Amino acid sequence: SGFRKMAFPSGKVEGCMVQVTCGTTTLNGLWLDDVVYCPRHVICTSEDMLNPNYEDLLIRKSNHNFLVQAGNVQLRVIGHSMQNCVLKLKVDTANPKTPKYKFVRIQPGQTFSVLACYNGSPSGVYQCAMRPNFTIKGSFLNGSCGSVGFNIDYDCVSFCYMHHMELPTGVHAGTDLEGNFYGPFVDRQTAQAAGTDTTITVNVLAWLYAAVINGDRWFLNRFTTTLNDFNLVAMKYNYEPLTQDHVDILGPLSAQTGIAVLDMCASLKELLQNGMNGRTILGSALLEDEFTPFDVVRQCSGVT
Amino acid sequence: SGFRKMAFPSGKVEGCMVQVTCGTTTLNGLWLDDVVYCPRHVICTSEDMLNPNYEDLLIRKSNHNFLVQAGNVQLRVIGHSMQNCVLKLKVDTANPKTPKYKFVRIQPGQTFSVLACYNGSPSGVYQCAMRPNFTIKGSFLNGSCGSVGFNIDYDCVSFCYMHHMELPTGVHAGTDLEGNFYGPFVDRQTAQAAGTDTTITVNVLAWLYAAVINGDRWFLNRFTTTLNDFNLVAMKYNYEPLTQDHVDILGPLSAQTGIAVLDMCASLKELLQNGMNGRTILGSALLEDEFTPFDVVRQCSGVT
Hints:
homodimer, 3 domains, 8 helices, Thrombin, subunit H, 3C-like proteinase nsp5 (chains A, B), elongated, main proteinase (3clpro) structure, domain 3, 6-stranded mixed beta sheet, 13 strands, alpha+beta
């Protein structure tokens, strides 16, 4: 019993973190096989960040200008290339701690663990969601760039995020491991406003199922609804529309609890309309949306 | 910017987790040097848990009855002893991944990371606090016993908790690594009710400092208070009394923000009396008390 914002164990990723320095910029790199992946803005001064031409800045850089340190041992850089917004530094040594891995590009609403790093050294691990506006609400200071987001399926690390940018609003933007930004963001210090941070409806419903499983049941009401009726209310409250695909994904939690998805929708509808009235659900005074249906099943079933 | 419930990177602890089986009971062990530490209730059937005599049950157990598996390799048990509520299984092999470590007994209000494990395999990491009633609000299923709580100071893991028990209220109880329960709890399936779960006042104040640092300032008011006046209000709201020792501990955050501790107390007093009025602080609708002043400084300064 109990339900926590739980991150993946970070060890497999800790084994991959390195320091990358180019001139006076130091950030983090991900070392997988004989390639170190890092944000291309490693090559920028803060002056350059205002209007960088990455291809032109990169011409002035040689392999030996990229200083890669793993622990307190230097890696030899034998090649470098730019792929979208990441650099790939080819080193002469395969990371002996390379886990089984994949690069995945996640969808908004999907959750992942972040290993916050500074100078190639892990400081902390926390759980995030790709927001519907393609920001993430992280905890990142100067030097945190190249920190990565990931999921683990048994022994396979799926890397889904690399940290590049903080927006003036103090929310975060970054890339998949192919260097493609999530959403419309760019690695330039310019006006970049985020769109509406809508609530991830399917995740709230999952978390209400988590609450029922863990004994928090006060919000279960006598009502049901339809997807169309629920969605009129979702729209009004800046919740994402619920699809039949979301209903299908919640099936296992519906089955485990015996509460029909549309009945839980009607409970959520009343919570939106009435509020919590000073009550809590799983120790929260607001409706939590950074647990996926898969997260709730995993945590409630104890997958390793 | 941003402020997250952040756990220590778990890798150093993942390297220590093993499976312990005695008869039909399987739980987790901590392997440090040539000793495996596990809950003594590994020797109990669920029938035994109703009224166990551990010394008498232990007489019927030999070294070879304790099956210790690290990955998919068996460790040879060459000795066993009971220390308070833990067993110490001496094995013939020092854990080659033993980090620098200490055993510490933490005080209520202190926070730590939990590596939730099943069958010696890590499932997740999350942040906890030793509650003022000496419970913790964890996420633990059958098989999670022997999962450990820890802090890390650079490269030294301080182990402070081992998971033993879920109370009928679905809150958690366990020991330090000397096998001494936190609070009055026992490793027996009996009536054990928790006392008042008071709010860790110094931790709330730390988290309000975190909020100011991270741009959330709407709750800063024009008032101050005294420790005695604040404490009259704390008492009424089931907050722990604030001491001058707590004020001293908040000094660095006071200094960084220029907000006197007693001014932040007066802001907290108004929040208690007025509520949040549907507003949030660092994405929470309630006052968070599982960040210590040290946690806020660490996360806000990026210690590795």
